[PDB]
Structures are given as structure tokens and as C-alpha cells.
Design a protein around this ligand. Structure first.
Ligand SMILES: CCCCCCCCCCO[C@@H]1O[C@H](CO)[C@@H](O[C@H]2O[C@H](CO)[C@@H](O)[C@H](O)[C@H]2O)[C@H](O)[C@H]1O
Ligand code: NI
Lengths: 585, 561, 124
């Protein structure tokens, strides 16, 4: 495929182009050495025995004239196999940061992990252990056909006529064996997917007294699939064993007619041997390499997943936002539409957030709220419409301008293994220690530093002291506060068991001296009561827009949401006085 | 090691039959070669009789007998495997229905989809393809070299020097490598972790600068510079010349030893004809041995894991000889050395709400799980209405004790079937009453298919709405004793209010045992039990525990500002 | 009314380059320790830009990159005033300087309070 000539490293296209023809003549030299077995053994005893090793001196010419060309192909392939080993994983590594994060599915992240980890020595001996043994063994049955032409043409074209029928026969045996492993992996998956389902629902089944009714239904469904498997073994391998039989039927076949339908050629018992050395390495390696052919073809395809389908964000670096740098910008959505595949997430949204204020986005978990922040931050781009920061399209921004424009507090802390101070300095590594101290204090990370013997130098990875969810969040808030971006986004997912984490979010929104346009997807009244504007997002559309006091006076969707969140904080088990029968409130 | 052999114990006879029968087959598969040389030398002997058809189809009679025997065993062996896997799945289904429910608690918190299938595929290869492919790769090369060492002796010894050219060079290789034989497996294992963190840190790299980009390649470069430092020096030229002493050089040193034809060797040239056809592909014949046993070990490791699941202790069934729960000197431990619950006595009055609070290590989660027999106690007893839970079956117990915990599961079926999983014969009217009490009805009727909507695989409702469905199921079950984890109320903050009102209807007119995390939610509980390192230290109402100035007062004050 | 916000600026005037000035903002109607106080400047014809701001708690200070290291903001709760000592005054700093406080917290649309500003002219 074009999989390998994608992995061809620069400065080495001449070493692979020479390799292409330098390994091609080796197949030509082993083809003349095979047809040189025709006369050498025909004179060794058949007629006029012992001829003083004439053709042996000419076969010793082509044997070690192949030794010279093959002592470089492996050596060249060894360095060529390491050159692709180096260029491949480096290119995929430098390409992943510039991938639209919509691409990072749970599965595409698993294939990307395989491509950049489990592809070490397999790519090292890629060419020498499979590419050169396959390129050679695929053209040898046709190489002797042109190397036998000068001995006999009715015997020569009969090889090129018989080389196309046996390749297709194996191509059908390899297709029957490939179509048989598919159904094999499907039934066993259907076998085990019922075992997994009965295991994950064991609590619900036992609590509902449905454990035995489901025990028999799965036991019989597995007993029926067990029967369907037995009948498909009877009518399948009557063909597989036939094709290695088909390998030895052509051997004794031609050797069984060249013995009786000839009579005029008892020097043609090298012909039974010449036909053998043509079929010695035909389906002997082809079956021995067909197990490692897709085992090396799809690691070139999961590798093809990263680079061929980069899905790199457009990011045309046309602008740098060098207007009012460091000033809180306005945020504008102009007919912004977004879809994850085929489902609509944002269905034409238009609003304009005035610069300097803070907006709270609420809504029934439609995942559009979080999408609104991703489009502002630049993690994703709108399918149609524009997102403008002070009238400048976020997609028209330079990579360094879009990176330094938005600061984000994700739902997850996203902390790396290292010192606690290093996880905060990610927001600004060259920031003065006064700014780092203020960020960790406003985020209330200093409350955590007291219980740490090493302070902010305490390593928080797996080899160090562990942090709780609320503490990890406060570290993430300090990281976002430390970055001097004129925009701050909070995808609120704060711990309900940490009053310091709840107070750190409020402080980060209301006690930050830096002018920032702030947007927060929040659920607590303590975090949204300070907002100047509320966007109620429902079914991919902004169905309410206004200030807190005026939305509460309208008595609509946000008014009910506010009253429910208020009652949720005052909630206590067994405190409604059995008044649930009348109002259901 | 014994776990794997115990599992395959009923197969020891069918496996050894597969070995000797496959050995005879591969001997028959080389038979058309041992007679083709005879057919050649029978013509050299000037026979060429009209009845030469005899030895012509005895080869046909053997190539057919070899394929018929190969097809007969590969079919008999696949059907022995299918019957073994069928009984094993029945044993697994029986095992999963008798293990303690706590054994499943986050046992598969990751998608174990593949490792169960990877083991069943490895278990299949071990029983059906391991033994035949193994002996077929060792008797085929060992039956030709003995057939070649009876042909010529020095021409047979002339091809024992290219194999020791390869072997001892790799023995020198396995000692020149030295420090780089144990690092390569670990560096390949530890480099997958740097890849996963690099993929997780993607949203940080886009927003903040960070060093995760350079932190990854530094671990990637010293890994490629690792094997290049020990697979380019002494392989770029050493195995460069031993991978050439095997392919075609066997033929050349056959004929330079075949030049001493009858001049000094004094042997018929077709006594070299066996070397013509089977001495050319001998090098590839005794290298594929290590790839036949490669599947046996990865297969027997799968059999050990399957037996380990079959060796796990089960919920022991014991004998008997207004839900009132009595915990009598209860103690529990997961591992046989570390205690979790330390001599706990507690009584849950019928119709009352009892709250379990405590700091880290209190064991309030484990203590509540024991009331539902998620694990059997190691000391003491737990009785429901005078009956020990160990003297009850899964139906008697879970008719008295229900539970609403985190990660509540929905089964493959409609909404109405999931709400009525504990009483499927109940009318749709009763199903709808439980949905309204669980504050999920208006969400259900808003769905296009309504109560006919199919849950289990993928649903349009969120985790908080999933919870309210299982709450409707628990309401419809109507247990006298209910074990509740309060963490289910704030697992989905966007729907915390609705889940709360559902819990209101759930916790009424029955004995309630609550795992409390937010102390302000259990201030009206009839009994608050404070746990510390597995022991009870305080028991009383909310105001009584505030007046004692003890552990509850400290926890309550800590949860303020 | 009796709790009417009022901000007045002072300390401006002409001073040649390399000099120094100290600005003051006498607030009224609200505690300067309750909200965040910000210093703005606006040259004639151009849009206003922030210069520095101080936290409500009093420890978090931020400065625009064009004044950081030369300008310093501080607060005196006792007099309820805000200070801004600007050293090494460059002619780019010639503008009308204002102090700002915003009425947030109250669940309404935030309203900005401004003073009449003080003229700061610096010649080179
Ligand atoms: C503060 C800025 C941070 C913004 C980060 C947002 C990144 C979004 C890229 C893909 O991530 C997915 O986002 C979907 C929502 O956008 C979600 O899918 C879910 O949501 C949709 C349903 O609304 C469906 O398309 C999906 O199948 C369903 O899995 C799901 O959480 C997540 O895997
Ligand atoms: Ni099979």
C-alpha cells in the first residue's frame, strides 16, 4: 500500500530506490541458479556421468554474486528499517497536538496509543524480516519463468500460465481462511458478550430476583449458539485441508506425467526437482508470512489513522489579535452550528457577550453548554457560523494568539505527575513568584499546602502524596488564574465535599483583579449568583437570555431552575412532612 | 501453575492423541518425497515397465490419506474444544451467580471486552491448534535429518555446520546484549504509560503551554535510542551474515559436497537425491519450533486465570438450625490480615432512618454493604427479622433488603421492564406510579417511544435520569429494609433536585440505612452512627451528637465555611 | 442618596520624562476593601485602557505590561482611598487617568462607577 511510501524518510529516497533494484537482481540471480540445476544434475548421472563440475563453477558464480547483493540489502534494510522506525513515531508525536479534539474518541485514542508505543522493534526489522522476504518470494515463481525461457519456451510460458492460476488458488485459500476467522471472532464475541452482560447486571438481577430466569435464557442461548458452531465446522475445513493437498497434487501430478508421458527424458528427473525448487518457497513462506502480513499491515493502518486522518484544525494564522491586547474582549456567536457526527449539538446560536462581564450558561445537560466553551476556547470549531473575539474570528487566529487568549478550568483537573507548584506554573512558566503566590492563594491552594510537609514542592503524582478531588480542582483553578488570558472559562465540576473548592471558584470569578471576560457552565447558585448575564441553553438553542433579577421576575425556565437549586441545598432526608401526595414538589 | 493444569485435566487424553496422530500425518506428508526419489531411481534401474502406474498412485494414495487424516483430526479436535468451552461457560454462569455481590464492585471498572475474548481465543489455540502445530514442527525436521544421515553421512554432516554457524552466534548475542535483555520488556511496558498521559493532556496542551509535549518525546527518544544502541551494532553485521548462511547456501554446499559423487564417496547420485529436495528447506524447519510453543504458554496463562475465577470462594449457604435489622458483634476484612469493621453492634428499628457517618477509613460504605450480603461477615452475624442473612437465599434476602447504590445497572429492555424488574407482572399503572414517585415520569412521556423506549445499550437520558429509573425499580420492589448511598444524590449535579425528591418517596415507611457524606442531609435521621476506623464511637440524634462535643461535632464544624 | 457612590481623582499635572507622580482616588458610598479597584487611562481620541487593579482582599495586584515595573497600586482602608505611584513616566503615559469600581454581587447587571479623572501630561 501507500502506507510504506508515506513512512519513507527524507534524505533516504535514494537508498530505497537503489534497494528496490538492488534486491530485484537477487531474484534474477536465484532464478538462473535454479535453471542451472537443470543441466548440472542432468549430466551428473543421467547421461554421461560426472562432468568435472563445470556448471558448479558457474553456479558458484551466481550463488556468491547473490551473497554480495544480499549482504547489503539486509544491512541497507537494517538502517532503512531503523530510519523508518525513527521518522514514523516522531511524525505522529508532533502531529497529535494539532488534531481536532473531536477526533479523540475512546477507540481512536486506543489506536493512537498502539501506534506510538507497541510499534518499536516491529518497525525496526520491518523491511528485513517481511518486506524483503515477501517481495522476493512473490516474484521468484515468475523469475524462473523468464530464466527458463532460454531452455524451453513451451516449458517457459507453461510456467507463466501456471503462475497465475496457483496465485489465485492461494488467494482464494487465503480468502477462505480470512473469511473463516471473521465468523470465528464473531461467534466467540457473541459467546462472551452474553457472559459480560450477565456479570455487569448481577446486582440488579439478584436484587430483582431475576438471576435464575436470566441464568437459563443465557445458558440456552449459549447452548443454541454451541450447536450452530458445531454444524459450521463440518462444512468448512473440507476445503482448507484441500489446499495443502492442492500443493502436493501439482508436485506428483507433473512429476507423474513427466515420467510416463515422456519416456524420452530420464534426464528430466531434475525436472521433477526443478519444479520442486520452484515450489519449495511458494506457499511454504506465503502461509508462514500470511500470519504476519496483516499483523504488520494494520499496524501500518492504525499508524495510518494518525497521519492520513490528521483532521488538523484549520487554524489559519492570519491574525494575532494585536488590537487591544490584554483587554477583556467581547464574545460573539453568529449563527454558530455544531454537530458531533450527525446529531445536532448547537442549532444556530446567536449572542454577544459584552466585554468585562461574566456569563453563566445553564441548561439540561444537553452538552451544548460545554460545546459553547470549547468553541470559544478553540478546542473545536463551528460547523457553520462564526465565533468572534472582539470582531475577530477565533479560527483566523495565530496558534500562539489563540492559545494565549483563553484560560480554562475544565471539569477534570488534568494534573500531571510532578510537584504541586509545577502543576500551577503550567499557566505561566515565566511568571514572577509574586503572581504564582497570589494565584495559589486565591484558588485556596495554600490551605492544602499546610497539610503538605514539602509545601508546593510536594510531588502529587503516583510516586508522591495523593490529592483529593477538591484539592486537585483548586490546583487546576490556580493554573488557570496564573495564565494572564483576557478570557476565562469554567466547566464547573466542583466537589460537593469541599467547601474550600466551592469558595475557590467564587473567588476566581469575583476576586480576580485581572480584567477578563468570564463564561462558566455551572450548577450551584453560589457560583452563578454573581453573573451579570445568564444563557439558558435547551436543545441546542438559547431559549432564555437576561439578567438574574429579570429572569427570576419572568417566572420561566431559569426561575424554576433557581428555586430547585435553592431547595436542593436545604434538602434533608425525611423532612417533607408527607406533603408529597398533593403537589409533588 | 496447578490452576491451569487442573482446568485442562479432563483433556489430557484427547491432547496426547492429537500428538501421535499428527506425528503420523506429517510423516505421511513427507512420504510423497521419499518415494519420488524411488520413482526416479526405479527408472535409473532401467525398469520403466508398463505397470509403473503402481508407484504413481501410491503417492496419490498417501497425499490423500494425509489430507483425510489431517481433516479428520482437525474436525474432531475442534468439536472437543467446542464441548469443553460449552461446559466451561455453564460453569462460569453458575459461578457468577454464586460469588458475593461485592466481588463485582468495580471488578471490571475498565472495558474487559477484549481480555475475555483474548483469553478464549488463546484457550482455543491451546486445546485445538497448540499440540498438532507443535509436534508437526519438530518431527518433520527430526525425521528428515535421520533420513538424510542414512543417505550420505558427510553430506549429512556437511549441513550440520551451517546450523551451528547460526546457533552459537546467537548464544554470543544473548550474552553480548546482557543489560539490554531485561530493559526492553520493561521499557516497552513503561512507554505505553507516557503515551496515555500524552493523550490525556491534550486539552491542557491546547489551552496552557505545559511541558507534556517535551516530557513525552524525551521518554520516546531514549527508547528508540535504546534498541538502536543494541540492535544496530552487533546485528547490523553479525546476523547479517547468519541470515545468509540459511536461505540458499544450503544448496551450494550440498553440491560442492556432491562433487565427490562416486569418485571418492562411492554412493549413487540419487542417494543424494534426498538431499536435493529436503536439505534445501531444513534451516526454516527447526526455527519454527519456538513459534509453536509460543502459543502454549500464553494459552496456559489464560487457563490459570479461568480456573482462578473458578477457584474463588462463593457465598457460603448456611443452615437456620416491619424490617428489624440486628447487627451483632459484626466484623469484616477483605484480606485475611487487615481489619475493616471492628466488633460493631447496631439495631435498626422498623420504619426508622439510620445514618452512617464518619471520616476517612470509617468503613461506613463496607458496613452498609454487609447488610445486603455483598460480603459475608468474618465475625458475628447480621439478622433481618430474627433470621440471619447467611441462612437466606437470594430471593428471601433481596425481598427484604433492597439497595440504591452508585453505578446502578439497567438491563437490556424497555423502560417499563426496567422499572418492573422486581415484579414484571405488575400493571403499567403501577409501573407509572413508581415513575412519578421517582420524578422520571415526565421525562419518560417526553421520549418519543415513552415507556416503550429501549434502555441498556444507548439511551437519550442522562446519568441522573438513569438513576431515577433504578429508583423507580427499587420503589416498585418495596423492600422493608433499604440500604442507601447518599452519593447518588450529587452524582449528577444537573439533576440533584429531582433525585432528592425521588429519595423522599423511596425512604418512607421502611427501615432505611444511609451512607451519609454530607452531614446536613441526615440531620433529621432517627439514629446517627459515627464510625471511626471500623468502630462505633458515637450514636445519637443530630443535636445529641452536637452536645457531646466529640467526633460528630468536629465533623459538623469542619463542614462549615 | 445617602449611600451614593462617588469617586474623585487627584495627583495629576505636568512633569517631564523620567519623573514620578502619585495618584489618589477618594471613594465614597462603599468600602474600597469590598470590591476591586482599577486604574484606567484614556488619551484624547483613543479608547480607554486599564493600567492596574488591586484585589478586594488586598494581596492580588495586576499591571498592564506597558507599566509593570514602573507603576505601583496600593490601598489605604483607613482613608478609603486608592493610590497609584507611577515612576519613570514615559510620554506614552500621557492620558486622563480614572479609578473604577463595579456594582456586582447584587443579582443584577453590573454597573460601572467612574470619576471625573485627573490629567497627567508627561513631556520628553
Ligand atoms: C470547557 C471547555 C471543554 C470542552 C470539551 C468538549 C470536548 C467535546 C469533544 C468530544 O467529547 C465528547 O463531547 C460530547 C458532547 O459534546 C459528549 O458525547 C456525548 O454527547 C452527545 C449527545 O449530546 C453525543 O454526540 C455523544 O454520542 C455522547 O457520547 C462526550 O461528553 C464527549 O465524549
Ligand atoms: Ni480453530
Amino acid at each position: 500500500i501507500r502506507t510504506l511510501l508515506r513512512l519513507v524518510p527524507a534524505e533516504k529516497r535514494g537508498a530505497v530506490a537503489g534497494y528496490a533494484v538492488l534486491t530485484l537482481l537477487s531474484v534474477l540471480l536465484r532464478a538462473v541458479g535454479a535453471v542451472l540445476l537443470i543441466p548440472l544434475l542432468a549430466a551428473l548421472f543421467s547421461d554421461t556421468p560426472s562432468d568435472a563440475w563445470l556448471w558448479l563453477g558457474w553456479l558458484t558464480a551466481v550463488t556468491l554474486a547473490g551473497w554480495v547483493t544480499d549482504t547489503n540489502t539486509a544491512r541497507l534494510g537494517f538502517d532503512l528499517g531503523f530510519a523508518v522506525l525513527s521518522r514514523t513515531q516522531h511524525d505522529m508525536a508532533d502531529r497529535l497536538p494539532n488534531v481536532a479534539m473531536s477526533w479523540f474518541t475512546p477507540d481512536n485514542t486506543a489506536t493512537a496509543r498502539q501506534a506510538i508505543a507497541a510499534t518499536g522493534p516491529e518497525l525496526a526489522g520491518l523491511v528485513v524480516n517481511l518486506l524483503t522476504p515477501l517481495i522476493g518470494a512473490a516474484l521468484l515463481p515468475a523469475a524462473i519463468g523468464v530464466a527458463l525461457l532460454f531452455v524451453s519456451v513451451p516449458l517457459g510460458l507453461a510456467a507463466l500460465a501456471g503462475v497465475a492460476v496457483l496465485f489465485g488458488a492461494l488467494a482464494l485459500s487465503g480468502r477462505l481462511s480470512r473469511a473463516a476467522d471473521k465468523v470465528a471472532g464473531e461467534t466467540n464475541s457473541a459467546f462472551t458478550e452474553r457472559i459480560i452482560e450477565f456479570a455487569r447486571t448481577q446486582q440488579a438481577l439478584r436484587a430483582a430476583r431475576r438471576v435464575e430466569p436470566a441464568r437459563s435464557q443465557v445458558g440456552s442461548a449459549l447452548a443454541a449458539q454451541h450447536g450452530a458452531g458445531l454444524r459450521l465446522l463440518t462444512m468448512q475445513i473440507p476445503g482448507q485441508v484441500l489446499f495443502s493437498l492442492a500443493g502436493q497434487v501439482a508436485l506428483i501430478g507433473f512429476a507423474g506425467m513427466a515420467v510416463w508421458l515422456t519416456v524420452r527424458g530420464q534426464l528430466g528427473v531434475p525436472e521433477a526437482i526443478a519444479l520442486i525448487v520452484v515450489l519449495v518457497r511458494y506457499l511454504e513462506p506465503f502461509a508462514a508470512i500470511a500470519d504476519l502480513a496483516p499483523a504488520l499491515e494494520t499496524t501500518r493502518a492504525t499508524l495510518n489513522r494518525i497521519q492520513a486522518v490528521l483532521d488538523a484544525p484549520t487554524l489559519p494564522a492570519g491574525r494575532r489579535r494585536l488590537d487591544r491586547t490584554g483587554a477583556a474582549p467581547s464574545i460573539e456567536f453568529d449563527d454558530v452550528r455544531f454537530s458531533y457526527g450527525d446529531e445536532v449539538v448547537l442549532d444556530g446560536v446567536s449572542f454577544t457577550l459584552r466585554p468585562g462581564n461574566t456569563t453563566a450558561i445553564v441548561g439540561p445537560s444537553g452538552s451544548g453548554k460545554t460545546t459553547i466553551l470549547s468553541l470559544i476556547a478553540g478546542l473545536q470549531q463551528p460547523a457553520s457560523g462564526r465565533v468572534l473575539l472582539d470582531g475577530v474570528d477565533v479560527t483566523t487566529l495565530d496558534p500562539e494568539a489563540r492559545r494565549a487568549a483563553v484560560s480554562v478550568v475544565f471539569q477534570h483537573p488534568y494534573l500531571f505527575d510532578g510537584t504541586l507548584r509545577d502543576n500551577v506554573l503550567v499557566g505561566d512558566p515565566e511568571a514572577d513568584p509574586d503572581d504564582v503566590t497570589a494565584a495559589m492563594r486565591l484558588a485556596r491552594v495554600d490551605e492544602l499546602l499546610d497539610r503538605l510537609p514539602d509545601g508546593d514542592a510536594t510531588v502529587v503524582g503516583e510516586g508522591g502524596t495523593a490529592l483529593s478531588g477538591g484539592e486537585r480542582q483548586r490546583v487546576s483553578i490556580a493554573r488557570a488564574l496564573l495564565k494572564p488570558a483576557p478570557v476565562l472559562l469554567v466547566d464547573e465540576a466542583t466537589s460537593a465535599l469541599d467547601n474550600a473548592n466551592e469558595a475557590a471558584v467564587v473567588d476566581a470569578l469575583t476576586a480576580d483583579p485581572r480584567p477578563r471576560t468570564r463564561v462558566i457552565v455551572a450548577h450551584r447558585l453560589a457560583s452563578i449568583r454573581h453573573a451579570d448575564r445568564v444563557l439558558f441553553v435547551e436543545a441546542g438553542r438559547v431559549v432564555e437570555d437576561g439578567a438574574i433579577d429579570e429572569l427570576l421576575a419572568a417566572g420561566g425556565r431559569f426561575a424554576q431552575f433557581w428555586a430547585q437549586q435553592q431547595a436542593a441545598s436545604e434538602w434533608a432526608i425525611g423532612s417533607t412532612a408527607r406533603a408529597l401526595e398533593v403537589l409533588f414538589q | 501453575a496447578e490452576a491451569g493444569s487442573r482446568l485442562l485435566a479432563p483433556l489430557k487424553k484427547p491432547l496426547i492423541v492429537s500428538g501421535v496422530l499428527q506425528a503420523l500425518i506429517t510423516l505421511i506428508e513427507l512420504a510423497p518425497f521419499v518415494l519420488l526419489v524411488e520413482l526416479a531411481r526405479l527408472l535409473l534401474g532401467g525398469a520403466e515397465a508398463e505397470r509403473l502406474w503402481t508407484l504413481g498412485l501410491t503417492a496419490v494414495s498417501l497425499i490423500g490419506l494425509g489430507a483425510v487424516l489431517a481433516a479428520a483430526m482437525t474436525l474432531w479436535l475442534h468439536r472437543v474444544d467446542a464441548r469443553f468451552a460449552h461446559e466451561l461457560r455453564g460453569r462460569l454462569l453458575t459461578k457468577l451467580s454464586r460469588l458475593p455481590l461485592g466481588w463485582f464492585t468495580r471488578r471490571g471498572s475498565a472495558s474487559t471486552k477484549q481480555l475475555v475474548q483474548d483469553d478464549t481465543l488463546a484457550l482455543h489455540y491451546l486445546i485445538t491448534h497448540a499440540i498438532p502445530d507443535a509436534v508437526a514442527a519438530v518431527v518433520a525436521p527430526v525425521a528428515v535429518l535421520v533420513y538424510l544421515f542414512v543417505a550420505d553421512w558427510r553430506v549429512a554432516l556437511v549441513l550440520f555446520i551451517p546450523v551451528l554457524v547460526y546457533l552459537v552466534l546467537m548464544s554470543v548475542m544473548t550474552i553480548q546484549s546482557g543489560s539490554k535483555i531485561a530493559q526492553a520488556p520493561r521499557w516497552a511496558e513503561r512507554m505505553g504509560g507516557e503515551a496515555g498521559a500524552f493523550l490525556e493532556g491534550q486539552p491542557v496542551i491546547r489551552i496552557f503551554g505545559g511541558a507534556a509535549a517535551s516530557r513525552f518525546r524525551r521518554r520516546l527518544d531514549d527508547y528508540i535510542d535504546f534498541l538502536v544502541s543494541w540492535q544496530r551494532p552487533f546485528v547490523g553485521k553479525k546476523t547479517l551474515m547468519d541470515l545468509v548462511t540459511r536461505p540458499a547456501t544450503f544448496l551450494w554446499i550440498i553440491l560442492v559436497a556432491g562433487v565427490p559423487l562416486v569418485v571418492t564417496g562411492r554412493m549413487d547420485p540419487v542417494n543424494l537425491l534426498p538431499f536435493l529436495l529436503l536439505g534445501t528447506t531444513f534451516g526454516a524447519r527447526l526455527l519454527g519450533i519456538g513459534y509453536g510453543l509460543s502459543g502454549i504458554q500464553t494459552g496456559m496463562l489464560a487457563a490459570r486465570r479461568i480456573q482462578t475465577v473458578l477457584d474463588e470462594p462463593e457465598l457460603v449457604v448456611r443452615d437456620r438450625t416491619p424490617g428489624t435489622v440486628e447487627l451483632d458483634r459484626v466484623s469484616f476484612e477483605y484480606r485475611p490480615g487487615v481489619p475493616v469493621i471492628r466488633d460493631v453492634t447496631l439495631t435498626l428499628r422498623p420504619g426508622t432512618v439510620t445514618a452512617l457517618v464518619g471520616p476517612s477509613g470509617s468503613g461506613k460504605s463496607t458496613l452498609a454493604a454487609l447488610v445486603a450480603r455483598f460480603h459475608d461477615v468474618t465475625q458475628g452475624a447480621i439478622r433481618v427479622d430474627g433470621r440471619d442473612i447467611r441462612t437466606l437465599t437470594a430471593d428471601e434476602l433481596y425481598r427484604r433488603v433492597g439497595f440504591v447504590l452508585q453505578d446502578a445497572q439497567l438491563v437490556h429492555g424497555s423502560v417499563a421492564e426496567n422499572i418492573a424488574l422486581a415484579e414484571p407482572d405488575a400493571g403499567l399503572e403501577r409501573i407509572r406510579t413508581a415513575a412519578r414517585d421517582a420524578q422520571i415520569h415526565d421525562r419518560i412521556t417526553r421520549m418519543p417511544d415513552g415507556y416503550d423506549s429501549v434502555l441498556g445499550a444507548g439511551s437519550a437520558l442522562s446519568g441522573g435520569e438513569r438513576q431515577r429509573v433504578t429508583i423507580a425499580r427499587a420503589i416498585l420492589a418495596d423492600t422493608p429494609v433499604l440500604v442507601l448511598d447518599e452519593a447518588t444524590a450529587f452524582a449528577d449535579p444537573e439533576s440533584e433536585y429531582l433525585v432528592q425528591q425521588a429519595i423522599n418517596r423511596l425512604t418512607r415507611d421502611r427501615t432505611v440505612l444511609v451512607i451519609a457524606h454530607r452531614l446536613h442531609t441526615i440531620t433529621h435521621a432517627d439514629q446517627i452512627v459515627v464510625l471511626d476506623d471500623g468502630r462505633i464511637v458515637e450514636v445519637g440524634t443530630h443535636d445529641e451528637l452536637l452536645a457531646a462535643g466529640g467526633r460528630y461535632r468536629g465533623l459538623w464544624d469542619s463542614g462549615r465555611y | 442618596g445617602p449611600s451614593q457612590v462617588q469617586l474623585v481623582e487627584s495627583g495629576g499635572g505636568l512633569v517631564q520624562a523620567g519623573g514620578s507622580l502619585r495618584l489618589s482616588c477618594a471613594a465614597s458610598g462603599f468600602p474600597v476593601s469590598s470590591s476591586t479597584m482599577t486604574w484606567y487611562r484614556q488619551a484624547p481620541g483613543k479608547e480607554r485602557e486599564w493600567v492596574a487593579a488591586i484585589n478586594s482582599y488586598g494581596y492580588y495586584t495586576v499591571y498592564a505590561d506597558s507599566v509593570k515595573g514602573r507603576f505601583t497600586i496600593s490601598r489605604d482602608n483607613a482613608k478609603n482611598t486608592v493610590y497609584l505611584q507611577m515612576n519613570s513616566l514615559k510620554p506614552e503615559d500621557t492620558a486622563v487617568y480614572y479609578c473604577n469600581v463595579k456594582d456586582t454581587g447584587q443579582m443584577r447587571e453590573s454597573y460601572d462607577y467612574w470619576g471625573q479623572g485627573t490629567q497627567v501630561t508627561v513631556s520628553a
